[model samples]
Target: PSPAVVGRSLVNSFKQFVSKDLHTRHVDATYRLVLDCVAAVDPLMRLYTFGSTVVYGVHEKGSDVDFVVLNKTDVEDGKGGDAATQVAKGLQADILAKLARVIRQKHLSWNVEEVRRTRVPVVRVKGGGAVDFDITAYRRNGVRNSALLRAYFEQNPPCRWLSMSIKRWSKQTGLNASVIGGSITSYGFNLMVVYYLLQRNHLQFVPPSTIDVSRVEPLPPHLPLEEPADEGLELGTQVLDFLHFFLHEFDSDKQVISLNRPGITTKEELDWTKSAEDFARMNGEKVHYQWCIEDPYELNLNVGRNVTPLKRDFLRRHLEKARDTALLTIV
Candidate 1:
């Protein structure tokens, strides 16, 4: 008739599986306790859940659930409440302690910590297996930096056109290694959700990680975000040029050049020290010795993920091109 304490009891007996053949049975047992906490507590609070978990197939292996909780009483004034923020720190502390108590009661091994500024605390579940869990919490309904910008990009017809074109090009060019539907150019999903909101309203907002999203401005109702003909798209010439430039300049061999430092050995790189001094002296004696190398990443500008993007090896090679051994581990 009600949510049972079986989950709690299972957590108590989870230790009996220490010698079991399965690797993650104990891990799963620990996870049941975390879910029990969520089911028990979420109803008493106002929580808006979102993230990769909501997006189909976007979930990572060992996925972490994300949520934003708004205090109904606090947001009654049309602004979100400080209650959620107030409890965020304390709530995490309480959650960590409760989790520890449950594990100790079961005499099972466990570890927990409060992820700062989040109403959600990550519960790390570890055992004889290699699997582990991480949970995070956030104060819901505060200003999200990317929401407004994302909304603007959605509402504007030209922006949607650009995103669609990029994705379509990625697909047609066989950017995905296999013939199946996946690519490094996965910017379409972000644009599609934003575009749908624009068609629905004056421009609904959602935030991103970079900065807080701004409010949306008015747009005509019933605006449809349709893909125009490739030749008919605006900024047609500039877009083509950017694509062409990207294809040639960007490859696995060349990454962001700025990250590359000069080789330690001095081997006849154009010594501009004297030349720079002479040039400065001729221009009224403010002589300065200088050797400036260009940044590669910057020079690879205006490219989409069109290139078979370089792997970590490129970065490592750039860092130590002449070295005999290629191992870059931090022991």
Candidate 2:
């Protein structure tokens, strides 16, 4: 079959799969409730949603609505570049604590949790519904990163097909979590998929530097060119290649998978091992893992900080299984 014909076929199939499993209706409903809760607390704070719902159009039913909330003070004070930067600079614990109290007071039915020990502080809310919501202090980087991911999906339709497939596979294989005992967060998996796509242009199928693989700068947040390149590879091929690269070629211990850096960057270059070690010690965290995945927009942050050794092993095993299956079974 022709490339365009085969591409659309796989894309449609994947969309069907996401729509069926993710149930966007639940996510939409939860988001509306979140907005209402936010309004109850501080209506002036800007809200930006990211994560799986924004990028993939499908989030696990009952999954939290991940968002960045710009406090009114941060928006008006001109403390940092903007609301995102001001919040990213780090909001005091009392701010979220007050916000949480206000939310609970306004909506007695909602369950609110203010987490202080996270890399970024968040206020978690559980409405009287199946879905939950998590609000982080506004991080300009988070907003930019989400925009970058959104733009990538918008421009490269084929890439979303690959991402949706891998996300499903990760969830099924139990490597999709980023909590202390969990393996990789949904955002981490997204980065890994993006790294693979960026690397594929140079390593396997396409020309050198096909897409912008540079480190994401902070001064001016820009989107990539809106040109979709199918490159004639079908969905099955993309998934198979993705699995094969991670299983066979990726070096989790010594290297870092980054979308921001030009091609691959070393963990040593970023001094991530030491930095993660320091952060872990400072935070009194245990179960530090081997992988270091740099957040594209947040240059200093490692999204894989919460990964445990056991979960990393679990991730490796799943990759091996997926690669073997792609080799022998996936047509």
Candidate 3:
């Protein structure tokens, strides 16, 4: 079998045990919306699946279909530009509207969500059984930057190690791997790490979308880069940079550093809660010092391994390697 098929089978194995068809269903539902959106709207625009599902390694269940519809026309950059806005957004609202349009359309399991910073929107429509029709919107212009960000993070060493540590620990313990969706969602494992970092340094790892990645001004000294100031960097360019690094650094094809998405059943033997406890133990006060910050998202890392040698070694190695890219900063 081709590597792609083999890999998918492995993921399916885990999904079966968990009794959650999120991965498979997400693909099925998202694709249908893609086709319908394109047909109902303009053909130039396209769908770019941006969230947890696309990232491949994470396990996102029946959450909103995370995606972006791009209109080539809307994408004005040297890249494709907003080529499919109507299809992405138009379809997002229209598709769901259709559910409410016809003879008491029954597949009303639909809801829409927005990620303003990335300019991505999501649509989730439900059917009678337990299935969901979900998708998100994006401008084709954003694809290059978004995909590049994803690729960059996956290629970077430190980011990859950071993600691997959390993923492995989660798998070993059981903190709730259900959140790993993909490059788009940003809710699963990625958020968990951000929370840890914020707590460690008392730095605010608030969702980057709310802040600018370009600002170099350190978090105000009083607000507590190590502690929550009244408010911190609003998701701006700086946050975007963080998002890019977050996606590309950890999301890769390599199995050595990769871990299953949250909420998966494939690696059941691992206990993430225990693993997390161990991680706190080994990393010492330094790691935990940052772990204290409160994440509004309520990312739970209480479970997992005690801290595997593999995880620590990976963390140490990546922390150094990341010095190169330096983890998106004031630059």
User: lDDT values of the candidates?
Assistant: 0.33, 0.60, 0.34
Residue lDDT tens for model 1, 1-41: 01122212222232332233322223334345554555455
Angstrom error of the Cα, residue 123, model 1: value is: 4.4
Q: Model 2: per-residue lDDT, tens digit, 199-224?
A: 87622332212322122221122222
Model 3: lDDT of residue 34? 50
TM-scores of the candidates in the order shown = 0.30, 0.70, 0.34
Better of 1 and 3 by lDDT: 3
Write down the worst ten-residue block by lDDT for model 3: 216-225
Arrange candidates by TM-score, highest first: which order? 2, 3, 1
TM-score, model 2 to reference: 0.70
Superposition-based RMSD of candidate 3 using all C-alpha atoms, in angstroms: 18.9
**Highest lDDT among the candidates is held by which one?**
2
Candidate 3 overall Cα lDDT vs. reference?
A: 0.34
True-structure lDDT of candidate 1: 0.33
